[PDB]
Design a protein around this ligand. Structure first.
Ligand SMILES: *CC(=O)N1CCN(Cc2cccc(C)c2)CC1
Ligand SMILES: *CC(=O)N1CCN(Cc2cccc(C)c2)CC1
Lengths: 304, 304
């Protein structure tokens, strides 16, 4: 029993982190096989960051200008290329700690673990969600860029995020491992405002299911609703619209608890309309939206 | 910027987890050098758990009855002993992945990471605090026993917790790695109620400092207080008394922010007396007490 904001064990990713230095700029890289992936802004001075021409800046860089250190051992760079907003550095040595891996581009509302790193060294691990506005609410200081987000399926790491940017509002933007930004963001020191941070409705409902499974049941009421009726309330409260696909995805939690998805929708409706009245659910005084239905099943079933 | 509930990277501990099976009971063990540490209740049937005599039960067990598996490789048990509520299994092979380590017995209010494991396999990592009633609010299913809590100082893992028990109220009890329970709990299926779960005041104040550093400042007010005056309010709200030792420990956060500890006490006082009025601090609608002053400094300074 108990329900915690839980990250994947980070060991397999820890074994992949390196330091990348180009001139005076140091950030983190991800060493998989004989390729080191890092943000392309490693090649910039902060002077460059106002309006960098990455293709022009990269012409001035040779393989020997990319200093790649894995622990206290230097890797030999034998090629480099830009793919979107990441650099790929070819090294002469396959990472012996390379796990089974994939590169995935996640959807908004999907959760992942971040291994925060500085100078190629792991500092901590936490759980994030890709927000509906394609930002993430992370914990990233200067030097953290190139830190990655991932999911683990038994022995396979799916890398979904690399950290590139802090918006002036203190939220985070980054890329998949093909170097494509989530959302409309660019690796430029410019006016970039996030859109509406809407609540991930399917995640809240999953977490209400997690609450019932763990004995927090005070919010269960006598009501039901319809998708259309619920969605009128969701709109009013900046909640994502709930789709039949979302209902289908909650089916297993519905089955385990015997609470129909639309009945749990009606509980959520009353919580939105009435608030918590100073009560808590799984130790929270607000509705948590950074657990997926898959996350709730996993934590409630104990998958390794 | 941003502030997250952050666990230590778990790789060094992942390399230490094994499966221990005694007859039909399987839980987790911690393999350090040539010793596997696990809860002594591995030797019980659930029949035994009402009033087990561990010394008598252990007489019936030989080295060959303790099946220890590290990945899919079996370890040879060459000795076994009971120390308090843990078994120490001597194996013929030093764990090659043994990190620099210590065993520490933590104080209430201290935070640590848990690597939740099932059948010797890591499932997830989260951050806990030893509560003032010597319980922890964890996420532990059947098979999770022998999962450990730890802190990391650069390259040294300090193991502070092993998971043994769920109280009927769904909170968690366990031992240090000398097998001494935190609090008054016993490894017996009996009536064991937790005392008052008081709020860790010094941790709340640290997290208010973390909020100010990260731009959440609405709760800062025009007031100060005294330790004695604050402590009258702390008592009323089931907050731990604040000591001058706590004030001394907050000194660095005081210095960084230029907010006197007693001024931040007066902010906390008004928050206790007035509530959040539907506002949030670092994405929370309640006062977070599972970050130590050391944790706030680390996350705010980026230690690896
Ligand atoms: C994440 C990290 O380490 N950072 C330090 C370098 N910064 C460079 C930068 C890139 C893109 C936009 C801006 C404004 C700055 C990024 C943060
Ligand atoms: C943590 C875990 O894996 N558990 C399964 C075995 N249970 C045995 C037990 C020990 C002490 C008290 C009780 C009531 C049960 C513990 C939980």
């Amino acid at each position: 029993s108990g329900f915690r904001k839980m990250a994947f064990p980070s060991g397999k990713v820890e074994g992949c982190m390196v330091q990348v230095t180009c001139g005076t700029t140091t950030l983190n890289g991800l060493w998989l096989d004989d390729v080191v992936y890092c943000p392309r802004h490693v090649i910039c001075t902060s002077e460059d960051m106002l309006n960098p021409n990455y293709e022009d800046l990269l012409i001035r860089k040779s393989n020997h200008n990319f200093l790649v250190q894995a622990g206290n051992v230097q890797l030999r760079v034998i090629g480099h290329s830009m793919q979107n907003c990441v650099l790929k550095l070819k090294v002469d040595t396959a990472n012996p700690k390379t796990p089974k891996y994939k590169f995935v581009r996640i959807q908004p509302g999907q959760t992942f673990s971040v291994l925060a790193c500085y100078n190629g060294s792991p500092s901590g691990v936490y759980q994030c969600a890709m927000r509906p506005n394609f930002t993430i609410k992370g914990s990233f200081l200067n030097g953290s860029c190139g830190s990655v987000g991932f999911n683990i399926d038994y022995d396979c790491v799916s890398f979904c995020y690399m950290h590139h940017m802090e918006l002036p509002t203190g939220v985070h933007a980054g890329t998949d491992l093909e170097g494509n930004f989530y959302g409309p963001f660019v690796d430029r020191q410019t006016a970039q405002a996030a859109g509406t941070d809407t609540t991930i409705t399917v995640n809240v409902l999953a977490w209400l299911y997690a609450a019932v499974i763990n004995g927090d049941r005070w919010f269960l009421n006598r009501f039901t609703t319809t998708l259309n009726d619920f969605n009128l309330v969701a709109m009013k409260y900046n909640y994502e619209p709930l789709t039949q696909d979302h209902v289908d995805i909650l089916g297993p939690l519905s089955a385990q608890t015997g609470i129909a998805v639309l009945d749990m929708c009606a509980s959520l409706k009353e919580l939105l309309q009435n608030g918590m009245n100073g009560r808590t659910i799984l130790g929270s005084a607000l509705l948590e939206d950074e657990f997926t239905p898959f996350d709730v099943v996993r934590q409630c079933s104990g998958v390794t």
